[PDB]
């Protein structure tokens, strides 16, 4: 049961780390689309610099608590899609399944 | 490999003690509740 | 709302009890042809080769053409008294399964609502994972497991023409004298209004 | 013979238990097309009119020829990843039903 | 007409008290017997 | 390079136990870390290794 609980806790931590990356990626997409439509510019480029800094910090944090799937990718903008996919793959299937499993075994050892 | 035969017995026991469907069936008043619920939901689904 | 709604667990239990008494056939000559036919299109619609879809397709016309030439001569084959009964029963069983997992889809969204709120409550930087989901106008409850199969099922159901296509064919089939022998009043009535209830459900 | 053979009651109970955990969906996009086609073929092969069958097979040949004309130009439609998965699951369920 | 709701409860009770499947499910040792029988019959059908 | 720096900065915050917890991960924070490094290369490492060896000799012997 403790093994299962550790699995669930790791999955929860991974998802919590990932979500800020998705938020920052959406903000980066908004800024990049604004800049592309524009094409004064230096301010947009500095905003993109700050957003990429936050992006990479979030990427490093996400790689921090990861135990696998994100190991292949890196903390770079071109690796945004894979991280995003992972988030979905968690909120869909890793977290629920794990959670269900836990809530099963907890009742197996107690009742 | 008996794991599929030892783990599986665990799943059945957990299913028996946890799944609402099996719990309801094993309860000694199952026919009465099911009959009422089936009749209730037969006519309306809202 | 003060009202009780059924869950998949109840639907599963009800299914077991209903199948407890006499239940329709599934290891039949029919539903064996159906699996023959289901495997047919799947491979025709699965092959990436253009030519194979060319090759496998033409022959069907060849076979399809020959049968009519037989038909023109008056070679139309009525099935049987018993064979028709079995086909009606098999068709009823296949159609009845279309509403089986409507309840299961609702459970998923309930859980997805459960899990989503927990993440919002259990995450220490609420400001972040709130605006990212509030400013958006997407589903926000995208349970891609059963719940996106429902989305696909909705798209097929909403298509017109075909749905009215069945309804007319159903009443034609329910009108057959052997149909009353195959099914009963309850089963006949349920099958007749099947498309209506599917849209309501 | 000193051996135990299963009955239909045991098979029903086993089916219920197996369906207890995660089970394949039947309210899917597939198995709706399947019911469409099954009702189609039942209607075609139940009619006693020869002329109605004439019309039905002729229409089917027309549509099939149009489809192959489209195919010759390279218009072959792969279904999908998810669509293929769903179709495989539906086919598995339909086949597995055969031994019930 | 309530006959379909009273006779139906009667049928449910009769099935619960008589049908081997429901009897086995409701028995407090159902998971063990079910697992053993399923494992036995998974491999051989003779 | 800026990206690179910040990433390494993050790695530092991975292992520090409070040496630079108050400091951030921005280039404005570069001097702080640098100072810490020099300390780790001036007194912390030498004196602490000396303490470890002194303990391993007074104890275990």
TrEMBL record, chain C:
Q: At the top level of its lineage, which domain of life is listed? A: Bacteria
Which segments does the entry list as coiled coil? 25-81
Q: What is this protein called?
A: DUF3375 family protein
Q: What is the lineage of its organism?
A: Bacteria, Pseudomonadati, Pseudomonadota, Gammaproteobacteria, Enterobacterales
